[model samples]
Target chain A: PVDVSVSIFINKIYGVNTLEQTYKVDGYIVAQWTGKPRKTPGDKPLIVENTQIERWINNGLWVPALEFINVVGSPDTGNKRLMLFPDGRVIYNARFLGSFSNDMDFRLFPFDRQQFVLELEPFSYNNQQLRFSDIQVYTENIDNEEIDEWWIRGKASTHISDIRYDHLSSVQPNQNEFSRITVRIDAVRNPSYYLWSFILPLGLIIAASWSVFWLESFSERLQTSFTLMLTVVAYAFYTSNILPRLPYTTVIDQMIIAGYGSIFAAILLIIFAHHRQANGVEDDLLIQRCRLAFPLGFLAIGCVLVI
Target chain B: PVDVSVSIFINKIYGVNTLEQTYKVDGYIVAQWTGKPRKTPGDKPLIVENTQIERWINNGLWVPALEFINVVGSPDTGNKRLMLFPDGRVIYNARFLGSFSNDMDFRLFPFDRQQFVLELEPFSYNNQQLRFSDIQVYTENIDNEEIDEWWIRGKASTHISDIRYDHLSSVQPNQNEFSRITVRIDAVRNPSYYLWSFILPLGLIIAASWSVFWLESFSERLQTSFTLMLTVVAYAFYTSNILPRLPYTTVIDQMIIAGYGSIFAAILLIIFAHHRQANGVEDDLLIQRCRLAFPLGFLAIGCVLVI
Candidate 1:
C-alpha cells in the first residue's frame, strides 16, 4: 500500500443545478508522494483529459472522484494539466468541470448563503480496506476570490462511509465498506453585480417612476404613470433575461415585486390624492410627500433586506 | 395493419435546455382509431397514469414516442387519460409532460417568435406510420390561453423516415425503418403578464427614479439615486427569478439596460444642470423646465422603444 497526501486549490466554482442535485467545480488537485528523487532533464507538469482520468480510476490506484454537490448544469472542463516531479512527489492538477446536484432554494438570491460541496470516494475501494487518515481544505481566499457571475465564500470538509444510492447500480462485496470524503465551500452574496447591473438601473427607473407625481395636471400624472408602468415592465423583462431562473422569491425579486406594488400603489394614491373628496383639494400634501417618504421608507425596508 | 390518426394538443411548453438540446412540453395526446360501434356502459373517458402508459407501450399497441429535438432534461408527466367512445372512434387523451429539443435564441423575448415542435414516431414499428391526410389545431383563444403558460400558434404537418442520431445506439434491419410525424406550433408573446405584473410596476419605479431630479436638496438627488439604484437591482432579481435563464440579451433585457443608462444619464445631467459653468447660472431655466422636459423626453424615447 502507498501513502498519498493530497491538496486541492480551488480557482472558481459556480453554477448550481437544483434538479440534478449537482454542482460544478473548477480547480486543481495537487497530490504529493515520497518515493525516490530523480534527476530529470526538464521540469514540466503532465496533463490528462476526461477518459484518461477514468482510466486511472479503473486501476487499483486511488483517485478520488470529487463531485460538486450544488452545480446546476454539467461542469465544463476548460484546460487540464498534471505535474510530475523529478523528486518522489507527484502532483496531479486538472481543471474540473461538471454540473453537480443539490437541494437549493434560491428564493433569497443576491443574499443567499449557499454551500458548494464535493463528494470524494475511491472509485472501487472500501473504508476498512483503504481508510482516509485526515482531510483539510483551503477556502480562506473565497471572499476575495475573483468576483464574476457568482460570489464564493470559504471551503468546508466532511467524510462518510458505506454510502449507497439505490437508484444507481448496486455494489455488492465492497458495498458496506466504501469510504466517502465530502468537501464543501460556503459562499455569501457578492451584491456588486446585482448592485451595479440591476439595482442602480432599477433605482433610476423607480426614481423616474415618481416623476408622474410632479406632473401639474391630473392627466399628466395618470397618463405619465401608465408610460412609467410600461417602462418598468420593459425594465423587468430586461432584468429577467440576465439573471438565473429560480422557483421561489429572492431578495432582489421581492424588491422588484415591491417596486411594482409601490408604483401601482402610487397610481392609486395619485388618483385618490387628486380625485378623493377631502376639502375638495387636489394632490394631497401628505400623499404627495410620499414621493420623498416612499423612497425613505423603501430605503428603510431595503436595509432590513441585508438581515 | 391498422390505420391510426393521432393529434397532440400541446398545453404549455417551456424550459429549453441548451446543452442537452431539449425542451419541456406539457400537453395532452389524442389518438383516434375507428373500431366497430357498440353500446358502452358509461360515456365517460378512461384515465391512465405513469405506469399504465408504459405498460400499454410495451404491449404491441401503437403509442408513438414524440421526442423534443432540444430538450435538456427529461419531461415531467402529469395526469393522463384515455377516452373510449361507444362509436368506432377511440380518442386517447392524456396529459403529456416532456422536455423537447429545439434551437432557441431568447435574445428578443417579448417580441420573438418561438416555434414549438414535436417529433412523433412509433416506438416499435417504422411502417406503422401516422397518416397526415388532415390535421387541425385550435389556438385562437388568446385571453383564455394567456391564463395558462404558453400560447400556441401556427400549425403544420410533415413526415420523415429512418432518422438517426450520432450519439445514440444505431437501429438494425426491421427496427431501422421508423416513420416520423412532425407537429409545429408558432407562438407570440402574451405581453399581458409582463404588462400587468412587470411593466406597470417598473413604470412606478422609474417614475420614482426620476423623482430624484425633483428633490429640493442636491444631497437628496445624489444619495437618493443610490437607494433607487439598489431598489432597481432588487426588482431585477425578482424578475430574473421568475423567468428563464439565457446567455444573450433579450428585448426586455435591453430595455432594462437602457433604464440603467437613462438613470445614469439623468444623474449626470442632474449633477451637470446644477454645476455647469455657463452664464454663471446655478440652475438654467431650461434645466428646471427639464422637470417637464425630461419626463416628456423619456416618454418620447420610450415610444421609440416600440419602434
Candidate 2:
C-alpha cells in the first residue's frame, strides 16, 4: 500500500449556509508519497508546474486522485505543482476553493455551533492499493472576538478511518475498505447582532403585548388583544423573512410562538372574565391584575426553553 | 518639503457593522519619502524593526507620523519596519488591523452598495513641511460572488487632496492646509441570502393575508381580519429584530407598513360593507368580492414604494 501523508492549509472559511448545510472553504492541499527513484536533470529533484505535471502523468506517473467526498460539486482548482525528488519522495501541491456539505443543527440559531468538515479518500483505490497514513490541518490561530461573524473554538480536528463499503461492485475481498481523512473545524455563531437586534426587540414586543390587561373596559381589552395578536403574526412573518430556513423551529421561533400563545390566552381570559360573573358581562378585578403576572410567567417559560 | 508616496496592500476587509457605520480592515502600509543621505553598514540600506525605529526617531531620524484620520480609537499595529537607503530614500512599513468609521447608508441593506474608505494625513506636519505626493492601493481583484458576502467592484479609487482646516492654532501662517491620501473600495452586498430568506417569504405572507375576503360570514371576514392585522404586526417586530437599525425606513420596512395598511383597510371595508346598507347588518356583494382588488392595489402601492 502506498500510504500518503496529507496536509491542508486553510486560507479562509466563509459563506456558511444553514439551509443547504454547507460552507465555503479556500485552501491548499499537499500530499506526499514515496515512489521508485527516477533519474532527473543532473540527478536533482524535478519540479513540475500544472501543465508539466499533466505531461508527467501522461508519461506513466502513478498519482492517486484524492477525491473530496463531501464537496458539493467540482471545486475551483488553482495552481498545481508536482515535486519529484531523486530519493523516491513525491509531493503534490494544489490550491482549491469549494463548497463542502455536512449535517448541521441550527435550532439555537444565533447561538448555534457549527462544524466545517472536509473528507478525502482515494477515488478508485481501496486501502490495499492507496491508503492514507496521516493528515495535518493548519487553520488560522488568530482570534477575532468582536470582528468576525463566527468564532473558531480550537484547532481543526482530524481523523483517519477505514471505510468498508457494503455495496461496491459486489466486493468479496478486503478491497472494499478504503482509508479516509476527515477534517473538522468547530465554530460558534456570534450572537451579539441577534441579541441587540432580534431578541431584544422581541422581548419588548412580548412585554408590550401584556399591557392589554391594564385596559379598564372589556371591549377595550378585547379589541387591543386583537392588535397584539396581529403584532405576533406580523413578527412571525418577519422572522420567516430574515432568519435562516430550517425544518425545525429555532429559539427565536419558539419565543414568537410563546408570544402568540400568551396573547391568545389573554384573549380567552378577557372574554371569559366578562361572562363568568354573577352580573352578566361584568369584569373580573383579579383577572385584570394579570398584566404583571403574565410577563413573569413568560420569563419563567423562556428559561424552561433553555433547559 | 518631503513628498511622501504611500502604498497600501489590503489583506482582508470584514466585520461590517451597519448600525455603528464601521468596518474592520487588515493591511500593510508602506510610506516612502526622501531625506538626507546617511551612511549604512557595508554601504547598504539600513533595516530597522519596530522598537529600533522608535530609537531612530529618538536620534532625530525625522520619521513623520502618518495618522489614519478616520480610524476608531487606536489600531493594532504589527511588524513595523524602516528601510533607510544610501540614496536618501526611507521607506516605512507596518501591518495594521483597525476599525474605521464612515457615513454609511443601509436603507438598502442586503442589496446595498457601500464604500470602505481610508484617509491618511500627517499628524503634526502641514503641507509645506510634509505633503503626500501620490498613493497606490492594491486590493484583491478576485471576484467571489457565490462564496463571499460582498463583491468588490473595480480597482480601488485613490486620490491625494489638500484639506484646509477652518480652525487651527491661533496666528497660523499658511499652516492650516494638510496633504491627505484617501482610498476608497466600492462593494455591493450579495443579495442572494436576503432574496431567498427574506423577501420571498414576506411576499408570501402579504399575498396570503389577502385570502381573508373569501370568507362568507361578515363576522368571519372581520374577525379573521384581526388575525391578519396581528400577522402584520408580528412581521414588523420580526423585521425590526434581524434587520440593521436605520434612522429612516428601508424598502422592506415600507412593505411591512403597506401590509398593515392593506389589512386595516380591509377591516374598514369589511365593517363598512355591513353598516352602509339599506337593510341593517347586510353585506354588499360587490365590496365583498374585492379579494383580487386588494392584492392588485397592494401590488401597485408596493411598486410606488420603490420609487
Candidate 3:
C-alpha cells in the first residue's frame, strides 16, 4: 500500500546461452520504502537478521516478483539480502545472480547488442490497485561499482508493459490485464580485456600454427600439421571453457572454425603443393612460396573479419 | 477399451546438445489396437490422417500419452498416422522425430554407454483399471532400419515404475497412485565413424601442432605458434560443434588444453633455447630434439589415456 523506490545495481552481464535460450546476470537490487518511524526498544533501531528477510520473501508478504523480461528460461537465483532503515525507509538489497534464457543469434557475438533486462511487478496485484508510478534508474555510476566476473557500466533503460500470457495460467478473469515494469541496461564491449588477454594471445597461437609449413623435412611437414591441429583443438577448449554455452555459433566460434579451416586447408595444400609433381622427386618453390603466401593471404582475409 | 500394442523402432540417435540438455532421436512407432469388427465403407481399412488422429487423442479418446521416462525434456513429435482394419485390430504406424533429454556425461563420449529411454503411461487412468501387462522393444533390428542423420541399432530394455509427484491439481485426491511403464535401450559406441573421421584426423592435427619448434628463424617460430594457436582453436570449435557442451572438461577438451600447453610451452622453450645462452647461440640440442621426442613421448602418454 506504500510507495516503494527500487534501484538495481548491475555488476556484470555476460554468458549468453543460445540453446537453452538463457543468459547470466550478476547484480545487486535495492528497494526502499518509507514508513512511520517507530520507537526504539533501547535507544537503537532494531535490526532484522538475514533469515527473517528471506522468510518474508518466501511467505509472500509484500515483495514483488521481478522477472527478466527477455529471459528465455528460468534464472538461477544466488545470494540475497534485505536492509530496513531507522528513518522510516526499507531498503531491500540482494545479489541477483542467475542464468536467464532468451532468443539470441550469437553468429555475431562480441559485436552484438545484448540487452540485460528485468521485469518487475507485484506478483498478485491488479492493474487498478498498487500501480507503479515511475521508476528512476541510477546505474550510471557503474564505474564505482564492484567488479566481479565482468565489468558493469552506464545507466539502465526502463520500459513498462501490460502483457497477457496465453498458456501460463488458467486465470481467464485476469486475461490481458497484468501490469509489468521492465528495466533494461545496454552495455558495450570492454574491448581492453579481451583484446589484450584473449585475442592477442589467440593471435600469437594462430601465427605459431603456420610454422608447420616451415619445417625442412617432408615428414615434418606432414607431422607438423597434425600437431598444429592438436594445438588448435587445445585453444578451442580454452575458449569454450571460458565462454558461455550457446546453440548457434558465435563470432569467436566462427573464428575458431575459420582457424580450423585455415590449418586443415594448409595441411591439404601443403601435401598437395609438395606432391603435385611427376617423379616424386620434385619440389615447387613457387608452390612452397605460396604456402608462405597463403598465410599472408589468410592475414589479409583476417583483416576483413575485424568489422 | 481396446488392447493396443506399440512397438518403437529406434532408427538413429545423434546430435546430443549439452547446452540444451537435449538429444535428437529418429524412430518409427507401430501401434496396434483391436476393436469390434465393423463393415468397411469401401471393402478396405480406413486410413486416418495425422490431424484426425491427434483430434481423436484429444477428445477423451483412448490415445495414451506415453511419456519418456529418461528423456531430458519433452519429446518433439514428427510424422504420425493411424491405420484402421475392418476386422477390428487397428494398427497405428508413425515416424517419430524428436530431441529427448536425459542425464548424460560425455567425458568419455567416444567409448561410453548412453541409455535412451521412454516412459509410457495413461495420462488419466488408474493402475488396476488400465494397465500395460507386457511391452516389447524392437531395437534389435536396427540394422534393417532406414538410414538418415543417424544410424540405428537395436538394444532395447524395459521396466515398470510407479511415480509420485508432490505437486498436483486439487482435483486429484491421491498424489502417489500413478503407475507407468518404463522402456530403456542401451547403446554402444559406433566407433566406426568417430575413429576414422574424427579421432584419426585429430591425432594427426595434434602431431602437427608440435612441429613448430623445427622452424629455423625466431620470427617463424613465434609467428608459426600463432597459426598453431589458431589451429588449436579451430580444432576445439570442430570438437565442440560436433560434440555436446558440458560444464566440466572432457577427455577431448583436456587433449585440446594439452595442445595449448604444448605449443605455449614450446614457444617458451623455443625462445629460451635460442635466447637464454651465451652470444644468443643455440645451446640445447637435446632440448631441440625434445620437440620431436615429445611427439613420441606424447604417443606413449596418450596410450595411457585409454587406461
Q: Of 1 and 2, which scores higher on DockQ?
A: 2
Model 2, A128-221: lDDT tens digits are: 2334433234434455445456678768878888898887886676678888888888888878757655576577567667656655568877
Candidate 3 residue lDDT tens string, B20-77: 4456777776767676775778979878777788565443234444444334334556
Whose DockQ is greatest here?
2
- For candidate 1, give the lDDT of residue A86: 64
- Candidate 2, B165-284: lDDT as tens digits: 553332256768888888888989888987787788888988888898999887567656656666656666666777775434566766765676677677667767876899876688
On TM-score, the leading prediction is 2
**Candidate 3 or 1, higher DockQ:** 1
By DockQ, highest first, what's the ranking? 2, 1, 3
lDDT for B306 in candidate 1 is 74
RMSD of each candidate? 17.1, 18.1, 17.0
Model 1, A181-264: lDDT tens digits are 566666666767788888788888877776666667654565455455546556766766667644334556666666676677
Question: Looking at model 3 chain A, which ten-residue stretch has the lowest summed lDDT?
Answer: A144-153
lDDT of 3 by residue, A1-307 (tens): 4555555555445455556655565555555566566554563333333345555557554555554555445544433444443555555555455665554555555545555567766555444322243323433444522222223443566665676766755666755455566766655443433443345556666666665555555665776677667766777787777665676677678667877888888788778866889778465656655646767888888888775
Stretch of 10 with least lDDT, candidate 3 chain B: B124-133
